[PDB]
Amino acid sequence: EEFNTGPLSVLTQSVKNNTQVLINCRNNKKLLGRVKAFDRHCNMVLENVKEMWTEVPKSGKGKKKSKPVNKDRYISKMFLRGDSVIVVLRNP
Amino acid sequence: IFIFNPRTGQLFLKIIHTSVWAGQKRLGQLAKWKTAEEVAALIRSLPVEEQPKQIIVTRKGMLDPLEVHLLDFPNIVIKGSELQLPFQACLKVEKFGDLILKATEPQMVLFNLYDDWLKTISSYTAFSRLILILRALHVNNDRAKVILKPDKTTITEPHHIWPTLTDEEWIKVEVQLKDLILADYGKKNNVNVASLTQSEIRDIILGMEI
Amino acid sequence: KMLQHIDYRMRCILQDGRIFIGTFKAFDKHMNLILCDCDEFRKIKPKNSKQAEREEKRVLGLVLLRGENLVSMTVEGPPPKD
Amino acid sequence: KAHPPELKKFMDKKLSLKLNGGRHVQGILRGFDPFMNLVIDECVEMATSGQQNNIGMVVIRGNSIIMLEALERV
Amino acid sequence: IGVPIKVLHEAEGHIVTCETNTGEVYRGKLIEAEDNMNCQMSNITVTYRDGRVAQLEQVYIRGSKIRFLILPDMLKNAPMLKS
Amino acid sequence: IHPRKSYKMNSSCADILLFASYKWNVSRPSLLADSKDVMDSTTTQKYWIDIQLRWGDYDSHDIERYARAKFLDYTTDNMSIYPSPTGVLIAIDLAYNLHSAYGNWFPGSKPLIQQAMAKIMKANPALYVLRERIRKGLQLYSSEP
Amino acid sequence: PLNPKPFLNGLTGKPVMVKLKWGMEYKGYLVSVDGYMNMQLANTEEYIDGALSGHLGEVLIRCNNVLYIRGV
Amino acid sequence: EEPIVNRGLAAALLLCQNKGLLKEKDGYKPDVKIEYVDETGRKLTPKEAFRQLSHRFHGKGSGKMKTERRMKKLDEEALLKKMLGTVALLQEQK
Amino acid sequence: KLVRFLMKLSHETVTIELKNGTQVHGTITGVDVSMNTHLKAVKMTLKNREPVQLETLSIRGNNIRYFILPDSLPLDTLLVD
Amino acid sequence: MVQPINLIFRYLQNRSRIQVWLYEQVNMRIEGCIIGFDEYMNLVLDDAEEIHSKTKSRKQLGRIMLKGDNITLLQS
Amino acid sequence: IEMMKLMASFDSTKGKKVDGSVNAYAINVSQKRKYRQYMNRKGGFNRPL
């Protein structure tokens, strides 16, 4: 009933179609991947996620001079605990 | 054969000897299928973790022999390119050039065209830096060579290719090679410099036609 | 699975990095901890160091740790006789 | 089942609250809830800049309250 | 109300210390200790993250902002070894 | 299902049996496309579904006439035992990749069998293997994108 | 004269901008609000520190991270 | 060229889009999904979905050697997609 | 409730990244309803430190950022009720 | 013997102006007049304005609603 | 009194079941296709269940 009209309709309309969602997490790692499931807490079990975050080389010169680099890692199947979710976003 | 990985910078440049086609008695009916079979033999040489699944041919007359010679690998994608990349600029640099010409045996010389820029910046902007270097060295050889050393004090190591510069020197030499590229283009392409947006600057360094 | 760890010499990590080791005697539904014999660590914790294995250390004795600040557990040695 | 915090010892007393972000506040207590939100008369703000800022009746969320010190003798 | 909150119930009127969420530690003698670990304590020294020492004769610290509570080992023996 | 029932052309059986846990109101036998359907005032609990495959030639590849004819042949036959008089018979033409059903419909069953037949002609793996077996027998291929 | 869930009742469908505690801002037509006040926004554009970094589409914004809601 | 900006999500979308990683009836929409999967949850090719169907149909699956090749193929995909340049840089020792 | 999916996952070698960045690679032994994760054969790398081998660990369930499950997991028969 | 909800009760009986201060964002303050609230202590506020104290900036907001577990104080 | 007309006494739904669509969970599973056996069964002709 109201499972499909609330604000979690972004998640239950993305787990039906198995489309990918972009999640800005709390430590500013970005999870791109398909929701296999979610719940009240947005404990989203996800398949095939690109986890994309930013680094700097952290003063490799000794003079604190470098530019941030985009790093990413692949995770096959994850269980993202949903407190660390800030925003979930369906794709355009 | 220049087999350039954008992501890992591992350039597999295969030396093709003069004796392969000085006395071959053949047409291009050997040539297309021969460069295709040798790049396929490179694919068969490497393990499955290092084999690609997407192969981009610069010259459009090679994807049709690559379809034939890579039916042992249906998992790979052979697309053409609208942007052509000047890897004859690799021939113009003296190291690869006399490496190729002095090589009496056909071989599978490896290189890493990003020297160690993967510990500093991305692989995308390292690719854009490499194609700035290669296109600017294609539009003028020794002018871009003397731009490539902003001082005559800097040196490259014998295991490197390009001179060891850090971020400030690299950004200044990048804008120097960039307006060198656009100055040579606007000298040749009848139109000025300041009428082009950065999408058009992007596909002029990349090799597309507007 | 924690009743299989009672009275042990437990190494409890907090969310600041202030590590405890002591007598895992009582826990709660929020994992509020009661630890006797417990001492605290910040910087170096022992795997047989080249200099000394236990500095940055303080005596506290018996603590009630709130479960809000608690992360992990590990037993380091068997329980003593007393 | 939320029992009220046991603060009739501290009613009508001059207390210095510590608040969350290293903050501080002073005033007379006037009441509470089970959530320990405190209502304060004669509230002087007392920031870390050093100059003391009177307000009056304020309400403080109990989440942000670290400690009470009864400056007056209870 | 489990066994640690019963332990701090059995620490009422005893010498107790609380390290707080910001890092201040408070060594005194308790007066009231509730279900939600709120502690009204007395004769107490406050030690900030500055390292300085202060004293005042009473304090009331909120329970969730407690990091931990140094208890005396008067309570280490009796009677909670049956736990 | 009997092992020779897939090509048991003369007679039939049932393939799926739906039990309601209630009594469905069901309709008169109408085609899969008959969007306006009238309610048959019987109420049923078990609802059979038959899958009749066929290989239509040029004369007789009307899958709607075939589904209607096979339904009203097999429900009024002696040599074809159905659990209920109420149920649906989905006919699928493999030579022309057509599909239609004719039998009775409970609520929601008509859009479900409509969309399920659509996805089952688009995506069935045995149909896919039949299709590419025909394509390799005819030596007819599509241009790769 | 107007309590919070009547307020969010009043603005389901108008363009608003909800501000996170972490300084982010989100402009768009919000769709719906639950009991916890998680928010579903459609047609969103994300304003980092008063300057937008992108049009994004449909976003779920979790209730533990909103700072306020602003009707624009 | 786009950094995943701290305090920002939309740059990650502009990154992943750049990288290309993207009777009185009831009255309702029955979203029929017809999906073929193996036991691991992988979405199944229609040739090998028919192969699973036909193994279950004939009652006789593959032999030992073809199962060795198929299983080693699936962990070749698993080992490939879970990921010598640094070894090349270290050898370039000369 | 999705935590019920995790307590069906007994005896799996999963890694767990926490809110302190500490990656814990080990065979999971028990889950509470509050995701209180009890692990064995633990290889715990607290981040900005070298990894430590420990025989048993028990993470509080609040402090889990995410899990990482292996390739060989049948979740289509695990998330059913 | 008054309560916090007695103060905010009397305060939206006043409709005067108040300034909410936040959890741990000590420079960030928000001024407004409450129109309504209930028991989760989310507050709608009249013509609110963010004042940044260390630069003394008044960014106008309008009809706002602020979330309950963020406030540290409401000063009249 | 208007504190009762507000509909007083600050609430905190911890443990208590929430009102509406907050509880929305949704699981996308699809099991392996259990087909039946036809060839070389040793069993009697109709299908097993």
Range of the domain at J37: 3-76
Cβ-in-10-Å burial (0-12, 13-18, 19+) of B82 comes to exposed
Q: How many domains are contained in chain I?
A: 1
Under a CB-based contact definition with an 8 Å cutoff, are residues C35 and E80 in contact? no
Under a CB-based contact definition with an 8 Å cutoff, are residues D46 and D52 in contact? yes
Range of the domain at D22: 8-70
* Alpha helix positions (H), B110-197: 124-139, 141-148, 167-188
Selecting from H39, H78, H82 the residue whose C-beta is nearest the C-beta of I74 gives H39
Distance CA J57, CA J51 (A): 5
Under a CB-based contact definition with an 8 Å cutoff, are residues C66 and I62 in contact? no
Residue D42 inside a domain? The answer is yes
Judged by 3 or more CB pairs under 8 A, whether A touches K is: yes
Shortest CA distance to J70 belongs to which of J34, J50, J39, J43? Answer: J43
Q: Which of K17, K19, K25 to mutate to test the interface with A (most CBs of A within 10 A)?
A: K25
Q: What is the largest CA-CA distance in chain H?
A: 84
Residues of chain F in contact with residue H44, where contact means CB-CB under 8 angstroms, are 125
| I31 min Cα distance to partner chain H (Å) | 23
- Any idea which residue has 């995410």 for tokens? I66
| H38 min Cα distance to partner chain F (Å) | 14
Domain extent listing, chain G: 1-72
Q: Which residues contact A19 (CB under 8 A, 6 or more apart)?
A: A34, A90, A91
Q: How many domains are contained in chain D?
A: 1
Q: Cβ–Cβ of C64/E7 closer than 8 Å?
A: yes
Q: Cβ–Cβ of E80/C25 closer than 8 Å?
A: yes
Q: Which residues contact E16 (CB under 8 A, 6 or more apart)?
A: E8, E28, E29, E30, E33, E39, E41, E69, E70, E71, E72
Element (H, E) at G67: strand G66-71
Distance CA J17, CA J37 (A): 15
Q: Which long-range contacts (CB under 8 A, 24 or more apart) does B18-23 make?
A: B20/B106
Give the number of beta-carbon pairs within 8 Å between C and E.
Answer: 69
DSSP string of F58-96, one letter each residue: STT--HHHHHHHHHHHHTT-SS---S-S-EEEEEEETTT
Q: Cβ–Cβ of I56/C5 closer than 8 Å?
A: yes
Helices B124-139, B198-205: inter-axial angle, 10-degree rounding: 70
The counts of H helices and E strands in chain F are 3, 4
Q: Cβ–Cβ of H40/I77 closer than 8 Å?
A: no
Cis peptide before E79 (omega within 30 of 0): yes
Q: Say yes or no: A75 contacts chain I, CB-CB below 8 A.
A: yes
Under a CB-based contact definition with an 8 Å cutoff, are residues E37 and E20 in contact? no
For chain E, domains (ranges, CATH) are 1-83 (2.30.30.100)
Chain G adjacent subunits, 3+ CB pairs under 8 A: A, H, J, K
Distance CA B81, CA B68 (A): 19
Selecting from A32, A54, A87 the residue whose C-beta is nearest the C-beta of H21 gives A32
Residues of chain D in contact with residue E22, where contact means CB-CB under 8 angstroms, are 22, 66
Q: Cβ–Cβ of E59/D69 closer than 8 Å?
A: yes
DSSP string of chain K, one letter each residue: -HHHHH-------SSSPPSSGGG--EE-----------SS--S-SSPP-
Q: Which of K3, K11, K19, K25 to mutate to test the interface with G (most CBs of G within 10 A)?
A: K19
Angle CA H74–H75–H78, to nearest 5: 95
Q: How far is CA J53 from the centre of its chain?
A: 15
What are the E-state strand segments in B48-131?
Answer: 54-57, 77-80, 110-112
Distance CA I66, CA I35 (A): 11
Residue B50 backbone class (left: φ over 0; alpha: ψ -120 to 50; beta: rest): alpha
Residue D55 inside a domain? The answer is yes
Selecting from B112, B124, B159 the residue whose C-beta is nearest the C-beta of H1 gives B124
Distance CA E75, CA E11 (A): 8
B69 phi and psi, to 5 degrees?
Answer: -80, -5
Q: Which residues contact F19 (CB under 8 A, 6 or more apart)?
A: F45, F46
| D48 min Cα distance to partner chain E (Å) | 15
> What are residue F98's DSSP bridge partners?
F93
Fold of G1-72: SH3 type barrels. (2.30.30)
Distance CA J47, CA G20 (A): 19
Range of the domain at I4: 1-81
Nearest CA in chain I to C28: I60
Q: Which residues contact H85 (CB under 8 A, 6 or more apart)?
A: B8, B9, B10, B112, B118
Chain F adjacent subunits, 3+ CB pairs under 8 A: H, K
Domain extent listing, chain C: 1-80
The count of residues in chain A is: 92
Check which CATH number belongs to the domain holding D48 and give it. Answer: 2.30.30.100
Selecting from I1, I2, I76 the residue whose C-beta is nearest the C-beta of K29 gives I76
Residues of chain K in contact with residue J4, where contact means CB-CB under 8 angstroms, are 10
Residues of chain K in contact with residue I1, where contact means CB-CB under 8 angstroms, are 25
C-alpha to C-alpha distances, B132 to B121, B180, B205, E7, H77, nearest whole angstrom: 16, 10, 7, 71, 35
Selecting from H37, H38, H57 the residue whose C-beta is nearest the C-beta of K37 gives H57
Distance CA B63, CA B80 (A): 7
Cβ-in-10-Å burial (0-12, 13-18, 19+) of A33 comes to buried
Under a CB-based contact definition with an 8 Å cutoff, are residues I6 and I38 in contact? no
Give the number of beta-carbon pairs within 8 Å between H and I.
Answer: 15
Q: Say yes or no: K20 contacts chain G, CB-CB below 8 A.
A: yes
Distance CA I81, CA H8 (A): 38
Selecting from E63, E69, E83 the residue whose C-beta is nearest the C-beta of C63 gives E69
Shortest CA distance to B150 belongs to which of B163, B136, B167? Answer: B163
Under a CB-based contact definition with an 8 Å cutoff, are residues B183 and B201 in contact? no
DSSP string of I21-80, one letter each residue: --EEEEEEEE--TT--EEEEEEEEE-TTS--EEEEEEEE-GGGEEEEEE-S---GGGTS-
Q: Cβ–Cβ of E22/D3 closer than 8 Å?
A: no
Residue type, B116: D
Sheet-wide strand order for B2-4:
B2-4, B10-13, B110-112
Nearest CA in chain A to G40: A7
Residue D3 inside a domain? The answer is no
C-alpha to C-alpha distances, B163 to A79, B114, B123, B154, B169, nearest whole angstrom: 46, 11, 18, 7, 11
Distance CA A86, CA A29 (A): 11
Tokens of residue F21, six digits: 């846990």
Q: Say yes or no: A91 contacts chain K, CB-CB below 8 A.
A: no
Query: In chain F, after which residues does the backbone break, taking C–N over 2.5 angstroms as a break?
Result: none
The count of residues in chain E is: 83
DSSP string of A47-68, one letter each residue: EEEEEEEEE---SSSSS-----
Tokens of residue B45, six digits: 């040489």
Sheet-wide strand order for F98-101:
F16-27, F39-54, F87-93, F98-101
Angle CA B4–B5–B9, to nearest 5: 95
- Any idea which residue has 């340049």 for tokens? H85
Tokens of residue F141, six digits: 């291929």
Residues of chain A in contact with residue K20, where contact means CB-CB under 8 angstroms, are 2, 6
Resolution in angstroms comes to 3.3
| F125 min Cα distance to partner chain H (Å) | 5
| A77 min Cα distance to partner chain B (Å) | 20
> What are residue I25's DSSP bridge partners?
I15, I43
E19 phi and psi, to 5 degrees?
Answer: -90, 135
Under a CB-based contact definition with an 8 Å cutoff, are residues I53 and I31 in contact? no
Q: Say yes or no: H23 contacts chain F, CB-CB below 8 A.
A: yes
Q: Which residues contact F30 (CB under 8 A, 6 or more apart)?
A: F37, F38, F102, F105
Shortest CA distance to A88 belongs to which of I68, H12, G50? Answer: H12
Shortest CA distance to G70 belongs to which of G28, G22, G42, G37? Answer: G28
| A22 min Cα distance to partner chain K (Å) | 18
Check which CATH number belongs to the domain holding I28 and give it. Answer: 2.30.30.100
Check which CATH number belongs to the domain holding J7 and give it. Answer: 2.30.30.100
Q: Cβ–Cβ of B166/A61 closer than 8 Å?
A: yes
Rg (CA), chain F: 16
Q: How many domains are contained in chain A?
A: 1
Within 13 A of C69's CA, how many CA atoms are on the CB side? 22
DSSP H74: H
Rg (CA), chain I: 12
Experimental method: cryo-EM
Distance CA K8, CA J7 (A): 12
Q: Cβ–Cβ of H57/K36 closer than 8 Å?
A: yes
Distance CA D18, CA F110 (A): 68
DSSP string of J2-71, one letter each residue: --HHHHHHHHTTTT--EEEEESS-TTEEEEEEEEEE-TT--EEEEEEEEEETTTTEEEEEEEEEE-GGGE
For chain C, first and last CA: distance in Å? 23
Q: Say yes or no: K19 contacts chain J, CB-CB below 8 A.
A: no
